């Protein structure tokens, strides 16, 4: 019947929308890889920033190294 043939033709009318739904599915699996790569980036540029900023991103945990040199002058 022509009615049946019409519904079969229309079954694939929303190709473009289904490709967009594919985009979402794949990008949701891939986007978490930004965290490992992000940690390493900050890890690399941390020593090139000022001392004042290095103590802020760590909540006062980080401090200058104490190796026993360059102490105050009497």
């Amino acid at each position: 019947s022509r009615a049946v043939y019409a519904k079969l033709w229309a079954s694939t009318a929303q190709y473009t929308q289904r490709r967009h739904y594919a985009w979402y599915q794949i990008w949701s699996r891939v986007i978490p890889w930004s965290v490992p790569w992000g940690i390493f980036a900050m890890w690399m540029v941390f020593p090139a920033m000022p001392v004042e900023y290095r103590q802020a991103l760590t909540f006062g945990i980080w401090q200058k190294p104490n190796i026993g040199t360059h102490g105050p002058d009497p």
Binding site: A6, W9, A10, A13
Partner: protein, 49 residues
């Protein structure tokens, strides 16, 4: 049968560019900003339901 009963233009003798056959296609077709070429045939646009 069409190929043996119809005449061909290339079998006639012409001598000047002004006597060449005129195409049945119209030159007025594709329009747009910065569209240099003005005549085309085929496209890949999707057909609807």
């Amino acid at each position: 049968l069409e190929e043996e009963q119809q005449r061909k233009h290339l079998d006639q003798e012409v001598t000047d560019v002004s006597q060449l056959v005129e195409p049945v296609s119209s030159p007025h077709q594709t329009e747009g900003w910065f569209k240099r070429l003005r005549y085309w045939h085929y496209k890949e646009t999707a057909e609807p339901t």
